Design a protein around this nucleic acid. Sequence first.
DNA 1: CCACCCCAA
DNA 2: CCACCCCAA
DNA 3: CCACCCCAA
DNA 4: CCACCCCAA
DNA 5: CCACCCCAA
Lengths: 548, 548, 195, 48, 97, 49
Amino acid sequence: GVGISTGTFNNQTEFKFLENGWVYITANSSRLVHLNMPESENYRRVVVNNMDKTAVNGNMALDDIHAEIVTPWSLVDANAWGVWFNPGDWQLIVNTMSELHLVSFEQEIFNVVLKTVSESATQPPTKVYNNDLTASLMVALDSNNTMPFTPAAMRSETLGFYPWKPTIPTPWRYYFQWDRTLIPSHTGTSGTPTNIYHGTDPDDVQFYTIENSVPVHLLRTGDEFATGTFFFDCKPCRLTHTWQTNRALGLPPFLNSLPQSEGDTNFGDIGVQQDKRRGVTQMGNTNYITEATIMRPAEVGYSAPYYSFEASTQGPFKTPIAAGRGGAQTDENQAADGNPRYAFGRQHGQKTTTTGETPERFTYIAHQDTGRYPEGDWIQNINFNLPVTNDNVLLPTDPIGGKTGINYTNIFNTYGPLTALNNVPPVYPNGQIWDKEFDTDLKPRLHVNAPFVCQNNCPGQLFVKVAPNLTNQYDPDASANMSRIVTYSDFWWKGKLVFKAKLRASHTWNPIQQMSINVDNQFNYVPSNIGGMKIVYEKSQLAPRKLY
Amino acid sequence: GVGISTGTFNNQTEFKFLENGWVYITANSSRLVHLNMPESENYRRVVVNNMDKTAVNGNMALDDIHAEIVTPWSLVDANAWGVWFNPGDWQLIVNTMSELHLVSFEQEIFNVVLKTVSESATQPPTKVYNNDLTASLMVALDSNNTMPFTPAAMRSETLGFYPWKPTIPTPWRYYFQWDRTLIPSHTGTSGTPTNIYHGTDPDDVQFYTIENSVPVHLLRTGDEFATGTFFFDCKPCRLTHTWQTNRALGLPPFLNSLPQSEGDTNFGDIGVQQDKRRGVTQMGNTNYITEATIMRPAEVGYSAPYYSFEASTQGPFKTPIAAGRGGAQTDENQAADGNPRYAFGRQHGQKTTTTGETPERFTYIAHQDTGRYPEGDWIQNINFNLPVTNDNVLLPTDPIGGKTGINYTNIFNTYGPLTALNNVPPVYPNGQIWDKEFDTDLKPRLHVNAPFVCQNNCPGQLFVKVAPNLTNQYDPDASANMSRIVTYSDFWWKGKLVFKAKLRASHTWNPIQQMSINVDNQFNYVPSNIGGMKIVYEKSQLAPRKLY
Amino acid sequence: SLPQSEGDTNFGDIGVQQDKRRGVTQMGNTNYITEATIMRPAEVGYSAPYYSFEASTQGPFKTPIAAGRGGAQTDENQAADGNPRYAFGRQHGQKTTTTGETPERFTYIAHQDTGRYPEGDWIQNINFNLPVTNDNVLLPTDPIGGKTGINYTNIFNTYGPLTALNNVPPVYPNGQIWDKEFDTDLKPRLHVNAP
Amino acid sequence: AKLRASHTWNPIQQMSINVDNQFNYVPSNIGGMKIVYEKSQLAPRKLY
Amino acid sequence: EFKFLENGWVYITANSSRLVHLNMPESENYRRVVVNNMDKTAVNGNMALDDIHAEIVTPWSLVDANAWGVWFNPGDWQLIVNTMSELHLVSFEQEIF
Amino acid sequence: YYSFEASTQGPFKTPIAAGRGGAQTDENQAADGNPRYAFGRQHGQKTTT
DNA sequence: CCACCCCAA
DNA sequence: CCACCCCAA
DNA sequence: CCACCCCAA
DNA sequence: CCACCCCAA
DNA sequence: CCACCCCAA
């Protein structure tokens, strides 16, 4: 064994150009992972109670109460964009390609090393590192996805985005059924509202164990653990955005009058009065045919309650939203159309030569315009009879429930069997790749965290742990937890992710928005005199498309 | 693994004599290379600004401003003559052979050893060296020459020329687009001329990475990395020099009068006046047919500006020249005909038992005479009507631009579609072997650094690095750069370079200039009582040939 | 020596004196190895006379040039590296809703840098012995022929069998596509009007 | 022609539509057209 | 038309069908004409303004399509420029109807 | 033109491969290096000379 | 896996 | 088990 | 040598 | 019975 | 002689 290599390193991005604008994208990410000895070799059940934040009777979205069980097992997640590509590759797929497709996935672990630490208390004292060539590593595959699913992208507990940079798995943990009650309360709400931790419903007690449910492969130094090739059965992702609303659909009016001189100030007037125009409307009252009135085939996107913090048996939680932009990013509401927010640090973006424990983030703002400006709507009477009168129109400005800050926009849900929609684009790096699917008879149309949602089972989680190294004293009949040899192990991980996508043709006349290097970009994609690295976020879908 | 050998040592020079004066020269150089742990495991971008030398307003050729990026990767170069032959072998190829041809090239690495250093702070303190048999070496081949090309001969960062002497690879580095401006200025030029470091043109930003672009082979102790056999498609090199100018071409005059007694003082006179001689001239004015006047089929070599420091977007740089000698090495200008200059130290010549940081060098002066004595030219009027008059002739002595030191010789470029030329001979040892070729639609006729310039792709660079050995503490989310185990590794490198050349026949009567051992050479090719070694430079092409 | 802190102001110094550096130069006089001195395999582009209006039996005509850019387009000479100039009207660019007989044009400035800043060269004595002295260096500023405006840069031709070159890129729209070839035994390496 | 692959890490200079381009590639209320000149070779390469 | 082949190879076939108009030639005779602008080349300053040449006019009207602007639009170019590395010229065929 | 170079053997004129240029009434029979030929009796020239 | 100072009894 | 800045002489 | 919370695509 | 400074296109 | 914004159901 312990004499020779087990694998090879490959962090290459291969572009296999096929026939009919079809390409083969096989991304390989061979990172060297380090891992320490688990604190406890015992499973824990821990309750988090931050009922010191949920008492101010102002703060209710700061509820951090949950019940989780810790596992001595250390997980490994590679479900991210930043791990599979660099700023150079992405630009290619984004500028050159139209739509992308996910294919294969196979993980491989090699060149396992396990070293023991000897603390020679002499003066300094000093530390002597050695090799326990008989030591082991405990590998586990949940090939039968028997266990919960913890995508470690959500909390930037992924793998390093810089290959030449050694990374670390994430200590595994999952949810245990915690029951609670918490009633809202503003600054004024007198007395203590209501908030408690019931405990646990004996029905919903799922206590998992990797040792019991999943085999463990005891690797040494001269052993290689490799997966297979995982074929993916999920829907394509489109590298295109829709810029069409409801006012940019169909046959525009006929302009009986056109300018005769230049300037975007000289407007071509139709030349007919609104209550004598031909065409179709979805009204039986009026005779006014307007760009706002006319009947359009359907509705793009929807309008839902914003900052609508619902709640159930586990506690309050915000209401998701799958909306593009809508309104020039100078007129948002980065809320209404729920724009993601990403917080990472040092190992998944951010300047490597930084300091402190303060993340950096960005509020990714797509290109697609299905989103809304809930500050330019209105609900009026069936009689129309405008110019509408106050008592005959409920606007954004007009409070609802007597309170100021509130709206009908805030409480509004316009989602009809006529709602048209586009899935959540990739958010690279940071962003997630693929995400399991709910086991509910009825399933969400699309997820908000990943462009891909697998239709069948997805790759099984790779759980990586260190095997207990024991001393000459060990009494299994002791209250305390024995004393083991301070062991750690570093191993090389490799990845092969396969994507298949199409090439974009030109059909307009006007060039399309591409990705480039400005005089303001340059030093965003290059190391610094000290070796300061960081990966910036960049828009995915930047290329027009027709919605109708 | 770790029990047995992986390779063998061979530093033998094989001469396979074939049929028709054809020989097979297979040089093998198996050197044992040592390599330390890279400072930083991060890539750097560093700017060099020596704007303390370029201010004296005298010194403009001392511009050392460039932008380079450091790579944790340590390179290995063997593109030299001294590594493949010894003073004994060369003499053979030089004295016996006519023309030489480059064939195969294959590298092989074996008997990898990785040791950790334990610093036992106790009294001295003391150092304890051990073996980390599970450690690794990261090998890389740029078989797809995706990366820049850094021939490490230029700066004598090659490999040792003495086989029984352990050597060291060169820390890899390459150029990053640096923009600058610098205007000349003599001792007098008042005020501060102009000189700045613009920065970087966002267009020309190439940030390479070996991990990303090239696979890495993780070698242990019981692993062998070997290349293939690289076939070379470059032009032959001639072990012959041309001694013919323009005055030694064709049918000399007929000497109507010959001496009748001895002495090189008794000259045989033609016996006809210059303005009544038969033959051809390239003049329509005169009737004077002279050895200087007569029409010769073409022109040997050319005459270019000397110490013509041009400049572009990166900064000033001297103008190359490919000229033999011209004038007895007692009358040079070691400038006009640009004679190379070589600076090495201890590991590539020079007396091993030397001290200090002061190179030794030599100004290699070929045998071929295509070079010029720009101190015996002249430009005169179309009327000729000599004896030429001042106002009718611009000579070397006559200043141009009003300044003394300057000439028309200094600013002169006589390169016509009639210029005949001979490539730059091998400069052994030191000198380079083969050099990639520019990727420009139009390409240089010949290089000034190497006899061989490959027509297609050349061998890929061999990048040798040490794998990060990590301790029990490592936080990838730290501003500082972790702490690794002080690891180094020594490995044996072997080389097989293949050459095919022809044998020289005798055709004159007078012996040809050969290489020998004088009473002044002897102790230039033998170790000393202490073991002082050094390799001297020696002329390549020493054997006549006809130019016409 | 490498910096230990950030900033493009903190430069990493080599740490060796110029007249004691190892490597190769194309000089037999000096011992100074500099980024300007060191021997490079060849020369990129060339340096020719600029606004060198020759003439023959048909009449005077300017001297072509096939050079990229060289120097940040903030430091040109749109002459030295002969940048094309294009004049069209209404049917080959230009705003259709225009008037008069006055073309519109552009001076296409490539990306490739083979071009030169002929305002940062110099020709000095074989002795080097710098800091160079006036009488020992002919610079751009220094007139040639007694006239001011003139240079040696203006009359200079550095084109050696070592000159590396890249052909003239497409200039779209306007620009030409393909162009016949001269019927001369000897032919131009590349044209300046067509890729 | 051939397709370009990515080999660096830093994105390459591409052609795009700015807020200053837009109306350089579209007819006008009257039908005013014109075609601007644009750089050809905008992508690095190695000379050595 | 962009015909994507195998091994990053593409086929670019540009078609430009323009409607040409043409008037009756002035003269149905060939001419030989000399241009002498020796009113510009006298100021003894202006020598690059020499517009003297000898040309012969043909009643025949030519047709040139040797340009980039005729074969592509700002949309197509951007593609070839952003997506492709090196370009190669192949066929050329003209048709009048 | 009339650029007499030199090397190790001695000075020698610089060749030129140029046609004519300018009406042979405006030459420089030098600039465009026009050949010059000198023979006698057995390769031209009047035999009865 | 040792042959006549190389490849190569 | 090195070919023309990727897969892939 | 990863398929739909086990053996077992 | 003339081929690339020998035998020997 | 109309198929999913090109060649090309």
